mmCIF file of C-alpha atoms and ligand atoms in Angstrom:
data_model
loop_
_atom_site.group_PDB
_atom_site.id
_atom_site.type_symbol
_atom_site.label_atom_id
_atom_site.label_comp_id
_atom_site.label_asym_id
_atom_site.label_seq_id
_atom_site.Cartn_x
_atom_site.Cartn_y
_atom_site.Cartn_z
ATOM 1 C CA UNK M 1 0.000 0.000 0.000
ATOM 2 C CA UNK M 2 2.929 2.340 0.667
ATOM 3 C CA UNK M 3 4.268 1.606 -2.820
ATOM 4 C CA UNK M 4 0.804 2.344 -4.225
ATOM 5 C CA UNK M 5 0.753 5.687 -2.404
ATOM 6 C CA UNK M 6 4.255 6.323 -3.773
ATOM 7 C CA UNK M 7 2.941 5.764 -7.296
ATOM 8 C CA UNK M 8 0.170 8.199 -6.354
ATOM 9 C CA UNK M 9 2.673 10.824 -5.164
ATOM 10 C CA UNK M 10 3.051 10.649 -1.360
ATOM 11 C CA UNK M 11 6.147 8.399 -1.404
ATOM 12 C CA UNK M 12 6.477 7.321 2.222
ATOM 13 C CA UNK M 13 9.520 5.234 3.130
ATOM 14 C CA UNK M 14 9.347 4.334 6.848
ATOM 15 C CA UNK M 15 6.925 2.964 9.432
ATOM 16 C CA UNK M 16 6.899 6.218 11.421
ATOM 17 C CA UNK M 17 5.361 7.745 8.279
ATOM 18 C CA UNK M 18 3.180 4.912 6.951
ATOM 19 C CA UNK M 19 1.450 4.549 10.314
ATOM 20 C CA UNK M 20 -1.161 6.746 8.623
ATOM 21 C CA UNK M 21 -1.160 4.334 5.673
ATOM 22 C CA UNK M 22 -1.906 1.547 8.158
ATOM 23 C CA UNK M 23 -4.737 3.730 9.476
ATOM 24 C CA UNK M 24 -6.071 4.220 5.921
ATOM 25 C CA UNK M 25 -7.465 0.688 6.267
ATOM 26 C CA UNK M 26 -10.135 2.221 8.525
ATOM 27 C CA UNK M 27 -11.973 3.391 5.377
ATOM 28 C CA UNK M 28 -10.141 2.167 2.225
ATOM 29 C CA UNK M 29 -11.107 -1.468 2.729
ATOM 30 C CA UNK M 30 -13.850 -2.270 0.197
ATOM 31 C CA UNK M 31 -13.991 -4.536 -2.857
ATOM 32 C CA UNK M 32 -16.932 -5.620 -5.007
ATOM 33 C CA UNK M 33 -15.733 -6.835 -8.429
ATOM 34 C CA UNK M 34 -12.602 -8.793 -7.561
ATOM 35 C CA UNK M 35 -11.652 -9.087 -11.240
ATOM 36 C CA UNK M 36 -12.307 -5.522 -12.455
ATOM 37 C CA UNK M 37 -13.351 -3.418 -9.436
ATOM 38 C CA UNK M 38 -10.410 -1.014 -9.572
ATOM 39 C CA UNK M 39 -10.729 -0.449 -13.329
ATOM 40 C CA UNK M 40 -14.516 -0.049 -13.279
ATOM 41 C CA UNK M 41 -14.175 2.406 -10.388
ATOM 42 C CA UNK M 42 -11.377 4.405 -12.009
ATOM 43 C CA UNK M 43 -13.721 4.693 -14.992
ATOM 44 C CA UNK M 44 -16.578 6.107 -12.869
ATOM 45 C CA UNK M 45 -14.727 7.528 -9.840
ATOM 46 C CA UNK M 46 -17.513 9.265 -7.934
ATOM 47 C CA UNK M 47 -19.022 8.707 -4.482
ATOM 48 C CA UNK M 48 -16.377 6.015 -3.903
ATOM 49 C CA UNK M 49 -13.310 8.156 -3.092
ATOM 50 C CA UNK M 50 -13.467 8.417 0.687
ATOM 51 C CA UNK M 51 -10.636 10.988 0.732
ATOM 52 C CA UNK M 52 -8.744 9.741 3.802
ATOM 53 C CA UNK M 53 -7.671 12.479 6.224
ATOM 54 C CA UNK M 54 -4.009 13.323 5.759
ATOM 55 C CA UNK M 55 -2.275 15.359 8.505
ATOM 56 C CA UNK M 56 -1.267 18.172 6.125
ATOM 57 C CA UNK M 57 -4.883 18.566 4.970
ATOM 58 C CA UNK M 58 -4.279 16.770 1.647
ATOM 59 C CA UNK M 59 -7.716 15.280 1.057
ATOM 60 C CA UNK M 60 -6.898 14.194 -2.528
ATOM 61 C CA UNK M 61 -9.635 11.872 -3.779
ATOM 62 C CA UNK M 62 -8.147 8.483 -2.877
ATOM 63 C CA UNK M 63 -10.019 6.230 -5.292
ATOM 64 C CA UNK M 64 -7.727 3.440 -6.501
ATOM 65 C CA UNK M 65 -6.265 1.958 -3.314
ATOM 66 C CA UNK M 66 -9.905 1.892 -2.176
ATOM 67 C CA UNK M 67 -10.129 -1.283 -4.283
ATOM 68 C CA UNK M 68 -6.443 -2.155 -4.654
ATOM 69 C CA UNK M 69 -5.242 -4.427 -1.823
ATOM 70 C CA UNK M 70 -8.456 -5.266 -0.252
ATOM 71 C CA UNK M 71 -8.520 -7.737 -3.150
ATOM 72 C CA UNK M 72 -4.862 -8.711 -2.651
ATOM 73 C CA UNK M 73 -6.194 -11.262 -0.157
ATOM 74 C CA UNK M 74 -8.164 -13.007 -2.910
ATOM 75 C CA UNK M 75 -5.452 -12.431 -5.546
ATOM 76 C CA UNK M 76 -1.926 -12.935 -4.132
ATOM 77 C CA UNK M 77 -0.566 -12.607 -7.676
ATOM 78 C CA UNK M 78 -1.722 -8.970 -7.525
ATOM 79 C CA UNK M 79 1.067 -8.179 -5.038
ATOM 80 C CA UNK M 80 3.870 -10.292 -6.502
ATOM 81 C CA UNK M 81 4.000 -13.139 -4.010
ATOM 82 C CA UNK M 82 2.089 -16.079 -5.460
ATOM 83 C CA UNK M 83 -0.324 -18.239 -3.482
ATOM 84 C CA UNK M 84 -3.864 -19.572 -3.605
ATOM 85 C CA UNK M 85 -6.350 -16.736 -3.279
ATOM 86 C CA UNK M 86 -7.557 -16.612 0.316
ATOM 87 C CA UNK M 87 -10.937 -17.995 -0.788
ATOM 88 C CA UNK M 88 -9.509 -20.928 -2.757
ATOM 89 C CA UNK M 89 -7.002 -21.470 0.068
ATOM 90 C CA UNK M 90 -9.812 -21.975 2.580
ATOM 91 C CA UNK M 91 -11.536 -24.119 -0.056
ATOM 92 C CA UNK M 92 -8.467 -26.347 -0.423
ATOM 93 C CA UNK M 93 -8.294 -26.600 3.367
ATOM 94 C CA UNK M 94 -11.852 -27.895 3.682
ATOM 95 C CA UNK M 95 -11.243 -30.113 0.636
ATOM 96 C CA UNK M 96 -8.250 -31.787 2.285
ATOM 97 C CA UNK M 97 -10.479 -32.143 5.341
ATOM 98 C CA UNK M 98 -12.752 -35.183 5.614
ATOM 99 C CA UNK M 99 -15.669 -35.679 3.200
ATOM 100 C CA UNK M 100 -18.531 -35.933 5.698
ATOM 101 C CA UNK M 101 -17.130 -33.126 7.875
ATOM 102 C CA UNK M 102 -16.777 -30.974 4.744
ATOM 103 C CA UNK M 103 -20.524 -30.254 4.828
ATOM 104 C CA UNK M 104 -20.240 -28.629 8.261
ATOM 105 C CA UNK M 105 -17.034 -26.935 7.087
ATOM 106 C CA UNK M 106 -18.994 -25.314 4.255
ATOM 107 C CA UNK M 107 -21.903 -24.468 6.575
ATOM 108 C CA UNK M 108 -19.822 -22.998 9.426
ATOM 109 C CA UNK M 109 -17.076 -20.947 7.745
ATOM 110 C CA UNK M 110 -16.161 -18.236 10.256
ATOM 111 C CA UNK M 111 -14.296 -14.981 9.582
ATOM 112 C CA UNK M 112 -12.175 -13.355 12.288
ATOM 113 C CA UNK M 113 -9.229 -11.008 12.698
ATOM 114 C CA UNK M 114 -8.529 -7.324 12.274
ATOM 115 C CA UNK M 115 -8.033 -7.746 8.531
ATOM 116 C CA UNK M 116 -11.531 -9.258 8.242
ATOM 117 C CA UNK M 117 -13.082 -5.887 9.156
ATOM 118 C CA UNK M 118 -13.195 -5.139 5.414
ATOM 119 C CA UNK M 119 -16.952 -4.902 4.657
ATOM 120 C CA UNK M 120 -16.573 -6.778 1.356
ATOM 121 C CA UNK M 121 -14.826 -9.888 2.684
ATOM 122 C CA UNK M 122 -18.119 -11.525 3.669
ATOM 123 C CA UNK M 123 -19.809 -11.138 0.280
ATOM 124 C CA UNK M 124 -16.662 -11.966 -1.689
ATOM 125 C CA UNK M 125 -16.064 -15.126 0.345
ATOM 126 C CA UNK M 126 -19.711 -16.049 -0.229
ATOM 127 C CA UNK M 127 -19.352 -15.649 -3.993
ATOM 128 C CA UNK M 128 -15.969 -17.359 -4.343
ATOM 129 C CA UNK M 129 -16.862 -20.313 -2.114
ATOM 130 C CA UNK M 130 -20.166 -20.774 -3.950
ATOM 131 C CA UNK M 131 -18.300 -20.734 -7.277
ATOM 132 C CA UNK M 132 -15.670 -23.206 -6.052
ATOM 133 C CA UNK M 133 -18.031 -25.492 -4.099
ATOM 134 C CA UNK M 134 -20.795 -27.868 -5.218
ATOM 135 C CA UNK M 135 -24.336 -26.614 -5.684
ATOM 136 C CA UNK M 136 -25.840 -28.875 -3.006
ATOM 137 C CA UNK M 137 -23.595 -27.409 -0.299
ATOM 138 C CA UNK M 138 -24.401 -23.790 0.547
ATOM 139 C CA UNK M 139 -22.242 -21.124 2.193
ATOM 140 C CA UNK M 140 -23.640 -19.866 5.514
ATOM 141 C CA UNK M 141 -20.989 -17.208 6.133
ATOM 142 C CA UNK M 142 -20.857 -15.791 9.667
ATOM 143 C CA UNK M 143 -18.946 -12.555 10.280
ATOM 144 C CA UNK M 144 -19.576 -11.346 13.847
ATOM 145 C CA UNK M 145 -20.379 -7.622 14.021
ATOM 146 C CA UNK M 146 -17.361 -7.271 16.350
ATOM 147 C CA UNK M 147 -15.019 -9.729 14.617
ATOM 148 C CA UNK M 148 -12.238 -7.225 15.398
ATOM 149 C CA UNK M 149 -11.754 -8.964 18.765
ATOM 150 C CA UNK M 150 -13.729 -12.198 18.306
ATOM 151 C CA UNK M 151 -10.634 -14.280 19.092
ATOM 152 C CA UNK M 152 -10.071 -12.389 22.343
ATOM 153 C CA UNK M 153 -13.764 -12.608 23.265
ATOM 154 C CA UNK M 154 -13.882 -16.356 22.674
ATOM 155 C CA UNK M 155 -10.667 -16.867 24.612
ATOM 156 C CA UNK M 156 -11.992 -14.873 27.559
ATOM 157 C CA UNK M 157 -15.201 -16.930 27.487
ATOM 158 C CA UNK M 158 -13.315 -20.234 27.357
ATOM 159 C CA UNK M 159 -11.218 -19.015 30.287
ATOM 160 C CA UNK M 160 -14.185 -17.824 32.379
ATOM 161 C CA UNK M 161 -16.223 -20.901 31.503
ATOM 162 C CA UNK M 162 -18.043 -22.128 34.599
ATOM 163 C CA UNK M 163 -17.302 -25.877 34.752
ATOM 164 C CA UNK M 164 -13.950 -25.617 32.924
ATOM 165 C CA UNK M 165 -12.083 -25.627 36.256
ATOM 166 C CA UNK M 166 -10.629 -29.145 36.149
ATOM 167 C CA UNK M 167 -8.784 -28.520 32.859
ATOM 168 C CA UNK M 168 -6.370 -25.881 34.212
ATOM 169 C CA UNK M 169 -2.742 -26.959 34.667
ATOM 170 C CA UNK M 170 -1.383 -26.178 38.132
ATOM 171 C CA UNK M 171 1.805 -26.023 40.187
ATOM 172 C CA UNK M 172 0.742 -29.344 41.721
ATOM 173 C CA UNK M 173 1.417 -31.334 38.546
ATOM 174 C CA UNK M 174 4.084 -28.876 37.372
ATOM 175 C CA UNK M 175 6.247 -29.787 40.392
ATOM 176 C CA UNK M 176 6.276 -33.450 39.271
ATOM 177 C CA UNK M 177 6.079 -33.348 35.451
ATOM 178 C CA UNK M 178 6.974 -29.770 34.538
ATOM 179 C CA UNK M 179 6.852 -28.922 30.824
ATOM 180 C CA UNK M 180 6.637 -32.687 30.207
ATOM 181 C CA UNK M 181 2.896 -32.098 30.761
ATOM 182 C CA UNK M 182 0.647 -32.461 27.697
ATOM 183 C CA UNK M 183 2.263 -29.310 26.220
ATOM 184 C CA UNK Q 1 34.539 -62.518 64.443
ATOM 185 C CA UNK Q 2 32.316 -59.438 64.276
ATOM 186 C CA UNK Q 3 28.743 -59.044 65.509
ATOM 187 C CA UNK Q 4 25.834 -56.771 64.591
ATOM 188 C CA UNK Q 5 24.200 -54.941 67.510
ATOM 189 C CA UNK Q 6 20.687 -53.699 66.708
ATOM 190 C CA UNK Q 7 18.428 -51.447 68.768
ATOM 191 C CA UNK Q 8 15.050 -50.560 67.301
ATOM 192 C CA UNK Q 9 12.158 -48.272 68.085
ATOM 193 C CA UNK Q 10 9.724 -45.761 66.658
ATOM 194 C CA UNK Q 11 12.171 -42.959 65.869
ATOM 195 C CA UNK Q 12 15.563 -44.663 65.491
ATOM 196 C CA UNK Q 13 16.882 -48.017 64.244
ATOM 197 C CA UNK Q 14 20.507 -48.092 65.388
ATOM 198 C CA UNK Q 15 22.439 -50.972 63.816
ATOM 199 C CA UNK Q 16 26.204 -51.205 64.123
ATOM 200 C CA UNK Q 17 29.002 -53.716 63.754
ATOM 201 C CA UNK Q 18 32.057 -54.166 65.953
ATOM 202 C CA UNK Q 19 33.912 -51.070 64.709
ATOM 203 C CA UNK Q 20 31.799 -48.487 62.826
ATOM 204 C CA UNK Q 21 28.296 -47.561 61.600
ATOM 205 C CA UNK Q 22 27.709 -45.240 64.566
ATOM 206 C CA UNK Q 23 24.870 -42.870 63.700
ATOM 207 C CA UNK Q 24 21.183 -42.059 64.185
ATOM 208 C CA UNK Q 25 19.765 -44.118 61.286
ATOM 209 C CA UNK Q 26 15.947 -43.949 61.561
ATOM 210 C CA UNK Q 27 13.526 -46.871 61.512
ATOM 211 C CA UNK Q 28 10.590 -45.416 59.560
ATOM 212 C CA UNK Q 29 10.050 -44.851 55.846
ATOM 213 C CA UNK Q 30 9.535 -41.401 54.336
ATOM 214 C CA UNK Q 31 7.145 -40.502 51.507
ATOM 215 C CA UNK Q 32 7.567 -37.105 49.859
ATOM 216 C CA UNK Q 33 4.415 -35.351 48.668
ATOM 217 C CA UNK Q 34 6.493 -33.806 45.860
ATOM 218 C CA UNK Q 35 8.809 -36.650 44.766
ATOM 219 C CA UNK Q 36 6.047 -38.598 43.009
ATOM 220 C CA UNK Q 37 5.137 -40.377 46.269
ATOM 221 C CA UNK Q 38 8.451 -42.248 46.283
ATOM 222 C CA UNK Q 39 8.915 -44.445 49.363
ATOM 223 C CA UNK Q 40 12.299 -43.722 50.931
ATOM 224 C CA UNK Q 41 14.117 -45.925 53.441
ATOM 225 C CA UNK Q 42 15.921 -45.153 56.702
ATOM 226 C CA UNK Q 43 19.051 -43.492 55.303
ATOM 227 C CA UNK Q 44 17.661 -42.528 51.878
ATOM 228 C CA UNK Q 45 16.085 -39.438 53.480
ATOM 229 C CA UNK Q 46 19.397 -37.709 52.752
ATOM 230 C CA UNK Q 47 18.570 -38.096 49.047
ATOM 231 C CA UNK Q 48 15.401 -36.022 49.548
ATOM 232 C CA UNK Q 49 16.211 -32.422 48.616
ATOM 233 C CA UNK Q 50 13.005 -31.201 50.305
ATOM 234 C CA UNK Q 51 11.920 -33.005 53.509
ATOM 235 C CA UNK Q 52 8.934 -30.670 53.941
ATOM 236 C CA UNK Q 53 5.693 -32.559 54.465
ATOM 237 C CA UNK Q 54 7.252 -36.024 54.662
ATOM 238 C CA UNK Q 55 4.674 -38.707 55.451
ATOM 239 C CA UNK Q 56 6.073 -41.143 58.016
ATOM 240 C CA UNK Q 57 5.403 -44.872 57.674
ATOM 241 C CA UNK Q 58 6.279 -46.183 61.132
ATOM 242 C CA UNK Q 59 6.908 -49.814 62.142
ATOM 243 C CA UNK Q 60 6.490 -48.535 65.713
ATOM 244 C CA UNK Q 61 4.332 -45.558 66.626
ATOM 245 C CA UNK Q 62 4.969 -46.358 70.304
ATOM 246 C CA UNK Q 63 6.841 -49.015 72.258
ATOM 247 C CA UNK Q 64 5.292 -51.929 70.342
ATOM 248 C CA UNK Q 65 5.628 -53.047 66.731
ATOM 249 C CA UNK Q 66 3.224 -52.703 63.797
ATOM 250 C CA UNK Q 67 3.277 -53.653 60.105
ATOM 251 C CA UNK Q 68 6.278 -55.991 59.879
ATOM 252 C CA UNK Q 69 6.537 -55.119 56.168
ATOM 253 C CA UNK Q 70 8.169 -51.768 56.957
ATOM 254 C CA UNK Q 71 10.662 -53.245 59.429
ATOM 255 C CA UNK Q 72 11.683 -56.026 57.043
ATOM 256 C CA UNK Q 73 12.057 -53.555 54.167
ATOM 257 C CA UNK Q 74 14.243 -51.322 56.343
ATOM 258 C CA UNK Q 75 16.393 -54.282 57.384
ATOM 259 C CA UNK Q 76 16.777 -55.421 53.768
ATOM 260 C CA UNK Q 77 17.687 -51.937 52.523
ATOM 261 C CA UNK Q 78 20.228 -51.588 55.338
ATOM 262 C CA UNK Q 79 21.859 -54.983 54.823
ATOM 263 C CA UNK Q 80 21.945 -54.675 51.017
ATOM 264 C CA UNK Q 81 25.058 -52.479 51.122
ATOM 265 C CA UNK Q 82 27.970 -51.135 53.184
ATOM 266 C CA UNK Q 83 25.882 -50.972 56.376
ATOM 267 C CA UNK Q 84 26.143 -54.706 57.088
ATOM 268 C CA UNK Q 85 27.681 -56.554 54.110
ATOM 269 C CA UNK Q 86 24.709 -58.849 53.534
ATOM 270 C CA UNK Q 87 26.740 -61.985 54.328
ATOM 271 C CA UNK Q 88 24.407 -63.916 56.623
ATOM 272 C CA UNK Q 89 25.927 -66.985 58.276
ATOM 273 C CA UNK Q 90 29.376 -65.375 58.558
ATOM 274 C CA UNK Q 91 28.427 -63.336 61.641
ATOM 275 C CA UNK Q 92 25.652 -63.052 64.223
ATOM 276 C CA UNK Q 93 23.201 -60.380 65.370
ATOM 277 C CA UNK Q 94 22.105 -59.223 68.825
ATOM 278 C CA UNK Q 95 18.719 -57.462 68.836
ATOM 279 C CA UNK Q 96 17.190 -55.480 71.691
ATOM 280 C CA UNK Q 97 13.622 -56.018 72.937
ATOM 281 C CA UNK Q 98 11.297 -53.672 74.883
ATOM 282 C CA UNK Q 99 10.643 -54.056 78.603
ATOM 283 C CA UNK Q 100 7.272 -55.821 78.116
ATOM 284 C CA UNK Q 101 6.855 -56.460 74.397
ATOM 285 C CA UNK Q 102 4.446 -58.684 72.498
ATOM 286 C CA UNK Q 103 5.556 -62.222 73.286
ATOM 287 C CA UNK Q 104 4.064 -63.499 70.023
ATOM 288 C CA UNK Q 105 5.466 -60.643 67.932
ATOM 289 C CA UNK Q 106 8.931 -61.011 69.450
ATOM 290 C CA UNK Q 107 9.095 -64.790 69.052
ATOM 291 C CA UNK Q 108 7.899 -64.373 65.455
ATOM 292 C CA UNK Q 109 10.612 -61.755 64.919
ATOM 293 C CA UNK Q 110 13.164 -64.266 66.200
ATOM 294 C CA UNK Q 111 11.621 -66.872 63.882
ATOM 295 C CA UNK Q 112 11.974 -64.533 60.893
ATOM 296 C CA UNK Q 113 15.540 -63.689 61.911
ATOM 297 C CA UNK Q 114 16.460 -67.380 62.038
ATOM 298 C CA UNK Q 115 14.632 -68.309 58.826
ATOM 299 C CA UNK Q 116 14.911 -65.485 56.278
ATOM 300 C CA UNK Q 117 18.201 -63.801 57.225
ATOM 301 C CA UNK Q 118 19.497 -66.985 58.920
ATOM 302 C CA UNK Q 119 21.950 -65.408 61.325
ATOM 303 C CA UNK Q 120 24.072 -68.161 62.849
ATOM 304 C CA UNK Q 121 23.005 -66.891 66.289
ATOM 305 C CA UNK Q 122 20.734 -64.330 67.949
ATOM 306 C CA UNK Q 123 19.440 -63.746 71.472
ATOM 307 C CA UNK Q 124 16.636 -62.123 73.471
ATOM 308 C CA UNK Q 125 18.687 -59.549 75.417
ATOM 309 C CA UNK Q 126 16.794 -56.496 76.633
ATOM 310 C CA UNK Q 127 17.519 -52.893 75.687
ATOM 311 C CA UNK Q 128 17.738 -51.995 79.368
ATOM 312 C CA UNK Q 129 19.751 -55.131 80.120
ATOM 313 C CA UNK Q 130 22.460 -54.093 77.658
ATOM 314 C CA UNK Q 131 22.784 -50.661 79.280
ATOM 315 C CA UNK Q 132 22.859 -52.358 82.686
ATOM 316 C CA UNK Q 133 25.730 -54.571 81.529
ATOM 317 C CA UNK Q 134 27.548 -51.528 80.126
ATOM 318 C CA UNK Q 135 27.199 -49.672 83.430
ATOM 319 C CA UNK Q 136 28.272 -52.712 85.454
ATOM 320 C CA UNK Q 137 31.394 -53.073 83.307
ATOM 321 C CA UNK Q 138 32.097 -49.354 83.728
ATOM 322 C CA UNK Q 139 31.727 -49.632 87.530
ATOM 323 C CA UNK Q 140 32.584 -53.176 88.657
ATOM 324 C CA UNK Q 141 32.392 -52.050 92.302
ATOM 325 C CA UNK Q 142 28.620 -51.573 91.898
ATOM 326 C CA UNK Q 143 26.053 -54.294 92.586
ATOM 327 C CA UNK Q 144 22.722 -52.595 91.773
ATOM 328 C CA UNK Q 145 21.633 -49.885 89.340
ATOM 329 C CA UNK Q 146 18.436 -48.252 88.073
ATOM 330 C CA UNK Q 147 18.203 -47.214 84.424
ATOM 331 C CA UNK Q 148 16.110 -44.180 83.489
ATOM 332 C CA UNK Q 149 15.945 -44.623 79.707
ATOM 333 C CA UNK Q 150 14.017 -41.623 78.366
ATOM 334 C CA UNK Q 151 14.262 -42.497 74.700
ATOM 335 C CA UNK Q 152 12.718 -40.520 71.873
ATOM 336 C CA UNK Q 153 9.717 -42.872 72.160
ATOM 337 C CA UNK Q 154 10.418 -44.578 75.501
ATOM 338 C CA UNK Q 155 10.528 -43.762 79.208
ATOM 339 C CA UNK Q 156 11.614 -46.803 81.223
ATOM 340 C CA UNK Q 157 12.488 -46.926 84.917
ATOM 341 C CA UNK Q 158 14.115 -50.363 85.063
ATOM 342 C CA UNK Q 159 15.900 -51.846 88.113
ATOM 343 C CA UNK Q 160 18.821 -54.257 87.931
ATOM 344 C CA UNK Q 161 20.474 -56.160 90.771
ATOM 345 C CA UNK Q 162 22.444 -59.398 91.109
ATOM 346 C CA UNK Q 163 22.407 -59.664 87.297
ATOM 347 C CA UNK Q 164 18.628 -60.116 87.299
ATOM 348 C CA UNK Q 165 15.670 -57.804 86.729
ATOM 349 C CA UNK Q 166 12.492 -58.048 88.810
ATOM 350 C CA UNK Q 167 9.130 -57.542 87.100
ATOM 351 C CA UNK Q 168 7.434 -55.780 90.045
ATOM 352 C CA UNK Q 169 9.229 -52.408 90.426
ATOM 353 C CA UNK Q 170 9.488 -51.842 86.670
ATOM 354 C CA UNK Q 171 7.807 -48.686 85.370
ATOM 355 C CA UNK Q 172 7.076 -47.321 81.904
ATOM 356 C CA UNK Q 173 5.734 -43.866 81.043
ATOM 357 C CA UNK Q 174 3.992 -42.833 77.825
ATOM 358 C CA UNK Q 175 5.538 -39.331 77.884
ATOM 359 C CA UNK Q 176 8.139 -39.758 75.158
ATOM 360 C CA UNK Q 177 10.095 -37.618 72.737
ATOM 361 C CA UNK Q 178 7.472 -38.253 70.068
ATOM 362 C CA UNK Q 179 4.775 -36.910 72.389
ATOM 363 C CA UNK Q 180 6.940 -33.867 73.129
ATOM 364 C CA UNK Q 181 7.446 -33.225 69.410
ATOM 365 C CA UNK Q 182 3.723 -33.610 68.709
ATOM 366 C CA UNK Q 183 2.898 -31.233 71.566
ATOM 367 C CA UNK Q 184 5.345 -28.636 70.241
ATOM 368 C CA UNK Q 185 3.777 -29.063 66.794
ATOM 369 C CA UNK Q 186 0.262 -28.574 68.166
ATOM 370 C CA UNK Q 187 1.310 -25.553 70.239
ATOM 371 C CA UNK Q 188 3.021 -23.800 67.329
ATOM 372 C CA UNK Q 189 0.049 -24.624 65.099
ATOM 373 C CA UNK Q 190 -2.492 -23.251 67.579
ATOM 374 C CA UNK Q 191 -0.480 -20.106 68.371
ATOM 375 C CA UNK Q 192 0.495 -19.112 64.811
ATOM 376 C CA UNK Q 193 -2.545 -20.404 62.875
ATOM 377 C CA UNK Q 194 -5.415 -22.860 63.378
ATOM 378 C CA UNK Q 195 -3.707 -25.744 61.532
ATOM 379 C CA UNK Q 196 -0.083 -26.764 60.928
ATOM 380 C CA UNK Q 197 1.082 -30.374 60.615
ATOM 381 C CA UNK Q 198 4.746 -30.537 59.617
HETATM 382 N N1 ATP T 1 -11.246 -2.388 10.992
HETATM 383 C C1 ATP T 1 -10.206 -2.815 10.248
HETATM 384 N N2 ATP T 1 -10.297 -2.882 8.914
HETATM 385 C C2 ATP T 1 -9.266 -3.306 8.175
HETATM 386 N N3 ATP T 1 -8.089 -3.690 8.680
HETATM 387 C C3 ATP T 1 -7.865 -3.676 10.001
HETATM 388 C C4 ATP T 1 -8.941 -3.226 10.876
HETATM 389 N N4 ATP T 1 -8.471 -3.304 12.124
HETATM 390 C C5 ATP T 1 -7.202 -3.766 12.051
HETATM 391 N N5 ATP T 1 -6.845 -3.983 10.785
HETATM 392 C C6 ATP T 1 -5.531 -4.497 10.359
HETATM 393 O O1 ATP T 1 -5.369 -5.780 10.951
HETATM 394 C C7 ATP T 1 -4.155 -5.877 11.688
HETATM 395 C C8 ATP T 1 -4.439 -6.375 13.089
HETATM 396 O O2 ATP T 1 -4.865 -7.722 13.003
HETATM 397 P P1 ATP T 1 -5.754 -8.336 14.174
HETATM 398 O O3 ATP T 1 -5.619 -7.462 15.379
HETATM 399 O O4 ATP T 1 -7.108 -8.688 13.609
HETATM 400 O O5 ATP T 1 -4.948 -9.654 14.506
HETATM 401 P P2 ATP T 1 -3.529 -9.371 15.140
HETATM 402 O O6 ATP T 1 -3.503 -9.926 16.527
HETATM 403 O O7 ATP T 1 -3.163 -7.944 14.885
HETATM 404 O O8 ATP T 1 -2.583 -10.282 14.263
HETATM 405 P P3 ATP T 1 -1.929 -11.484 15.064
HETATM 406 O O9 ATP T 1 -3.131 -12.251 15.547
HETATM 407 O O10 ATP T 1 -1.088 -12.206 14.046
HETATM 408 O O11 ATP T 1 -1.133 -10.786 16.134
HETATM 409 C C9 ATP T 1 -3.551 -4.499 11.764
HETATM 410 O O12 ATP T 1 -2.198 -4.588 11.319
HETATM 411 C C10 ATP T 1 -4.425 -3.611 10.896
HETATM 412 O O13 ATP T 1 -3.695 -3.039 9.806
#
């Protein structure tokens, strides 16, 4: 993204500067047409350039990185490092998984993490997984409204689970097995 | 030839041959709450790097014997190495016996000594009788002596005269070193907290 902004004209070169580029993700995180979104939007750039707030007041109509590298997740070849597009990567995962369990894998595909806050990830995963998967199996995507910290929330719940007491490792067994415990 | 003198009780099991092995070797087994419940023997306590909370398995909790298993295990672990040089029929053993001990238990102990360890000879001398003989040898001009043996688990007032003990003026008292230690434990527990059992 810093290289993209350099092509634009800002030309940042260090983290102390591109902290604001990191922040740009707060608004420039949408993608609709994974194959031609950036071109179709550069052709009709209006009401899509959120104009991120630069410190110097430069509100230039950011309208290409709005759709460039939210899609880099689905198209690794777009960056330069090659890999299965995030969607087909998850698909290959559930494919290598068992056959019977693959139905529940299709039906319970969760999305979590700070990077998943991109509003378009849900719909794009829906479309790509429906294109890559059979017709009988549907895609019941579930993106929690607060997926930003879903991992932390679930961990805190698992920790403060009522009858989970017996499963905590303690000094008692540490003093006789140490790290040789289940690990 | 050499001989093996053995005195035994609740706290201490003092075995020694004609020249060395002079120490306070205990008689009970120790189990460490931390060392995977390993059962230690009389002298193996020195191998325990943390004797806190040791559970005591006692062949004697007071003057009389209980649970032969522990006593026989202690004797085997002692004999198995430098302490006695397990050789059996080469030498003999002299074991002490309480003032008024279980007749059946003591004769069965003699039976076991003759059968399993097969010492070429052993006798029924008394713990107080041995001290009486020691004192008589120390003072040959004496003809009568009273022994006040206040052991760690014993308190015996035993007379001796004309090389014979009389079973009428022979007193034993249950106030022993073990009782004193337990009372100190209880006092410290009660006066620092409401429970403490080390
Ligand atoms: N609302 C958001 N929209 C888009 N991107 C975001 C958002 N919030 C955070 N990010 C990006 O996601 C990253 C943080 O990831 P997240 O906190 O979800 O997991 P993480 O703990 O940071 O990563 P890891 O679990 O590997 O430590 C940040 O580097 C940030 O650029």
